[PDB]
Amino acid sequence: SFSLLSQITPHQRCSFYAQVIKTWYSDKNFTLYVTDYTENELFFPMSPYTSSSRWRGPFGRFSIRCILWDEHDFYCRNYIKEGDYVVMKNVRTKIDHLGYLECILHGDSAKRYNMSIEKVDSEEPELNEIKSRKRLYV
DNA sequence: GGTTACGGT
């Protein structure tokens, strides 16, 4: 089933709709920061006071970092863009060394876990709640 | 498999 981001907990498999806020590519992986405009106590409290950040919101504990490895990296790195909506299915969660939630997509060549990430056209009704909540923070 | 809310590649 699908969860809101406020509902996810560490060390589980989950699926959710979200909007991509930030992407970062490296030679090791591809990173997404995603939000569905619901709060989670385990998310990093994003500060509006940072000098010179390119982040424009949401602020506080409203976004989660996703680390994409292997085929997930190679597929998304020149495809998923900031602002895109995505549906992420059967991804894994963890807690990092500092105690924050993170989402991980490990390579799965064996096709054991049926993981996926795909773009969702902005017009899809599955995104209505994300859009209605975003209005609260603009 | 990586480190820390940036950097803006």
UniProtKB/Swiss-Prot annotation:
This protein's name: Protection of telomeres protein 1
Disulfide-linked positions: none
Oligomer status and interactors: Self-associates. Interacts with ccq1, poz1 and tpz1.
Parent-protein residues present: 200 to 337 of 555
Origin superkingdom: Eukaryota
Role description: Single-stranded telomeric DNA-binding protein that is required to protect the 3'-end telomeric overhang. It binds the consensus sequence 5'-GGTTAC-3'. Regulates telomerase and telomere length.
Residues of the signal peptide: none
Organism: Schizosaccharomyces pombe (strain 972 / ATCC 24843) (Fission yeast)
Location relative to the cell: Nucleus; Chromosome, Telomere
Family per similarity comment: Belongs to the telombin family.
